[PDB]
From a paper:
Cystathionine beta-synthase (CBS) is an essential metabolic enzyme across all domains of life for the production of glutathione, cysteine, and hydrogen sulfide. Human CBS adopts a unique multi-domain structure: an N-terminal haem binding domain (residues 38–74), a central PLP-dependent catalytic domain (CD, residues 75–382), and a C-terminal regulatory domain (RD, residues 411–551)5,11,12.
Multiple maps were processed using both helical and single particle reconstruction to resolutions of between 3.9 and 3.0 Å. Here the RD sits atop the active site entrance of the catalytic domain hindering substrate access. Specifically, one RD each from two neighbouring CBS dimers interact in a butterfly-like dimeric arrangement, related by C2 symmetry, such that the loop 516–525 from an RD of one dimer forms a clasp around an RD of the neighbouring dimer. The first interface is between the CBS-2 and CBS-1 motifs, involving loop 516–525 of one dimeric subunit and α-helix 15 of the neighbouring dimeric subunit. Here, main-chain interactions are mediated between β-strand 12 residues 516–519 of one RD and β-strand 8 residues 422–426 of the adjacent RD.
Numbering used by the authors:
A (entry chain C): 421 to 548
B (entry chain B), C (entry chain A): 42 to 548
Write the structure that this text describes.
Amino acid sequence: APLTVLPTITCGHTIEILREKGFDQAPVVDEAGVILGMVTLGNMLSSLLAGKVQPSDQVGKVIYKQFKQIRLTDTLGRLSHILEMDHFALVVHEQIQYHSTGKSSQRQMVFGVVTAIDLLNFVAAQER
Amino acid sequence: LWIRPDAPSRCTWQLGRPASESPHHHTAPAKSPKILPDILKKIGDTPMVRINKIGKKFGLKCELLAKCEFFNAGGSVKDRISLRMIEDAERDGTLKPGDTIIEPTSGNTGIGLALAAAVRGYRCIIVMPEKMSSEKVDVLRALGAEIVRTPTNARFDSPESHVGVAWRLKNEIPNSHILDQYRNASNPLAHYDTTADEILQQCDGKLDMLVASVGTGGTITGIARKLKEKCPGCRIIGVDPEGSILAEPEELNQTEQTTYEVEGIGYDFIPTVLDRTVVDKWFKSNDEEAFTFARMLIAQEGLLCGGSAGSTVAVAVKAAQELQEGQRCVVILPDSVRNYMTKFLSDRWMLQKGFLKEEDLTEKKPWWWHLRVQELGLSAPLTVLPTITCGHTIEILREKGFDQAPVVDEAGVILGMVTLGNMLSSLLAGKVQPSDQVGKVIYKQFKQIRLTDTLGRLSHILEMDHFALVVHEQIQYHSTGKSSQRQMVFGVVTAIDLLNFVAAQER
Amino acid sequence: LWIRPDAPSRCTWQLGRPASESPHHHTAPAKSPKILPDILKKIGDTPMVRINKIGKKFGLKCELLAKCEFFNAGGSVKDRISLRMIEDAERDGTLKPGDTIIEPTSGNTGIGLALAAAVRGYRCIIVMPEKMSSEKVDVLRALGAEIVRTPTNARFDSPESHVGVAWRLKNEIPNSHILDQYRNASNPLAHYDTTADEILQQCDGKLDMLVASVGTGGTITGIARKLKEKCPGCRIIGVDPEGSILAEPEELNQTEQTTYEVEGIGYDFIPTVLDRTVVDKWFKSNDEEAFTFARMLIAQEGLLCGGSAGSTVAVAVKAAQELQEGQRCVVILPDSVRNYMTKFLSDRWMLQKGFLKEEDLTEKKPWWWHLRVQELGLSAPLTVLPTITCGHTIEILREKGFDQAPVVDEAGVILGMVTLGNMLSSLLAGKVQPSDQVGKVIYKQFKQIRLTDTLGRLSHILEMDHFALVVHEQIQYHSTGKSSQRQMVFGVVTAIDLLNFVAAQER
Ligand code: HEM
Ligand code: HEM
């Protein structure tokens, strides 16, 4: 998940950055680090051609708001159970940043977006 | 005016003539005193080392011996000649105290002359091609010698070749002398007097084959002459790198390129001191096999030698095949590895030069070499600011059982690492009070790695740093113009963790 | 479970006791054979070299001698102990063929153990702090040893110190042994058996002062014990770098910083093998004087030694002041310069570290050092394209009398240089036909310099390249957005031109 976008970015802005680097999708995160959802290049193109959004419109209207957080340690079996209810499973990581053992803070970030397509491709490729 | 280095030798030596007819002043080797008046007396008496594994690896039935000449004061077989020529010039009155010495060299002779001059106060000017290593330049700078460089591909007859530049300098600087190792009889004479005698005494006067690399030709020339006078049965084998013309018959020298990485051997002309008539047979060698055999020598025999030694051994493993059990072979190892630290001794340099292939490098590696870092068990649940006090960190680490935690600033920049044990020891030793900040204990040195990297890259990193931090970078966009960068730490992997993982996966 | 390296010594040795009570297996030094079965036998019998100039420079009335231990196979005084501990482990049955050896070292002992293991097939794992030079890492990689790094500032009692990391590895890897030079009696025993005997025989059993650097403490400990048993009148002098606690009385160790660049000496704890009771007096030393004296040794005596040798000599020049004519001093030089090629041996590193000042560096330089390049007589009337043929260039150069001309492309990019003599020689040798392009003869290697630069910078450049091209850059503007770059060649200055200018201006 090399890059992420704030919800305020425009669809036209999002289209170029994705295509100039080839990524089909990017997570949406606010300034603090709260994950807001997932947005995909294909949907933006289809929506723009459908007229539901203009290139100047913000991505917040196209974002997918439903997803499930998962962590690296979880098994693929756990992931398969998750994928039966949500399309996107976001591999999040959490860190507690301390100042004086009283003033703690939490930080998080996204590193991979995995779907049933990705899982099946991994299984088929690794099956040797 | 100018005297060429390729001029035919005026020597009248021929096999069978008696030594009493020699115009030259031979010096009988003598036992040095228990205390050396100067470092220059630690030249000669070099050891003979039996090669144990390489001969078996290449099916040699004969005993293989190495004349490790890289143990001299200057680390070369060119210290002998430097001392001999300086002594002969002093004795003949050609060279006076405080004079200036100019010598065109490949670096080893320059180092020897610089050392002798520094000991004895002479001024030294070294003319050295560009391709020679920078380690020689550093050593010469330390010894106080002046260095002049010449193009690698310049022809010897050109006015800007090392010999030509030396000649031009001599005509300019007054009270200057050129010893001209390419023409001085002292070069081959030193070997004929000392090295051949050492070889014969160490071998008890019995040896069947001798292999030596050829530069100026003195090393092989004097040894061959003395041996043919004393041990006629010895076969003399010469080594000349591809791109040179020393080797005969001329059919061996047919090649398209004349540039080679090996240093100190091979020339575009026949030196005067080189007597090709005493060399029984010649072999050509290439840089790849030379460096491969040098690395093999270092790894299997402990001989810290250079590329020329590798070429010599590579030729010897072929030449000695004609020998049988009970016979003996001798190879001369000219110089040490000190002059090639950033050269073949470095894997990066070999890969850049193409002497090593990824297939060859990885084929010898363990099974886990290609696994990616993500397969490890790694986590960084918490991190701390540099401003937190020591005792506070002790509490937050002990309450959760973690032994270590990264240190990251407010903006997310990684500053280093801290460990519970180090802080506890410092508190016991009084180096830090509990209220003191962790910044006085944090480990500032670490290396960033990414999840996609292999375990081999991780090991290579760990050979230089204790902590390898698995860092991931995310770039956040606002309008394609206001980009921002974010990063976070996941796993701190050390050699301990990697070996524990290897052991666990091995069962 | 864990055994500390600072534990008090259980040895019961005291002056006057007879050797017959020693539990240890002493090895009597013996003459090596004329042919060494392996490189490991070339350890010991190191030379003693008289220091000639430094003593006079610092007003020493006594004879100063150097025990040059950097001539061993591994280039260190830590090869002796490596061999001795390996042999003792083999004899006692603790170590078996094919075993794995783990040793926490500063690099020299690691190199010795790696060499011995490669010769004998053992697996070697080296735990070395981060501050040690990369040359040691390269040598260890060549020898096939596995390398683990630890933080420089980690306390010895910490779990990630070199000793602690070695202990952790041993408990993990099966069939692994730690020789523990900090506790092994073999470390001091090797010196007590071989080095002290060599010193006594070389000195004829008469010496008044001995100066040695202190790391593990075995080198000084064994030598002092043997000398006090045999030559009680010798004063034992220890050297401990600033930032360490080995030196006593404790008043000498009061310093704010514990990080020092010198390698292999000084520790944050008292090793078990170190017997501080036999050391008559202690001296502290700093990195600056150590490296200064190492450079002075290299430049004035020809001894290619490291920083620890410099510290030892710096302390000796002070300690020996109490001596008078007819007395003798001995200093131990542990390691060679091979391990510090990019370190103090490099002027850039010293300037970066602050051990050298521009005032000191330039004060020794000639009068013309600070003159700017523009003061030279230099001109480049013509240049040629790479596509021109050889004969055409011969004609255009001979018709005007110029011997050389730069090569520049259409856009103005400099491609190198060509010379009349080289082309003529190539035509005579047949390497190029007259119709062939000059690109096969051009010198591709050159360095760009600017008119404002000094002649010292020019000389430093000339130590690495033959041609220094005086290039000037002009940037041409259209609208503050469409910038363009232009450059042109003025003067090709070599060492010949610089020395000719110096000679002309000297009259
Ligand atoms: C043992 C009987 C020898 C005789 C009768 C002999 C004869 C000579 C003579 C007369 C010269 C002077 C030529 C001149 O000044 O134009 C000379 C020079 C020389 N000698 Fe010998 N030599 C003998 C042995 C050796 C040996 C053993 C070596 C080497 C190991 C050697 C290497 C040389 C060389 C390289 C030169 C210089 C030739 C030149 O600069 O053109 N000679 N020799
Ligand atoms: C000559 C009479 C000597 C006697 C009677 C003696 C006595 C001993 C004994 C009994 C031990 C074993 C202690 C134990 O296992 O707990 C020992 C170990 C040791 N010996 Fe000696 N020793 C002598 C000479 C030397 C010499 C000449 C050296 C060094 C040059 C030396 C260095 C050591 C060291 C470093 C240890 C290890 C101590 C430890 O690990 O705690 N000893 N000695």
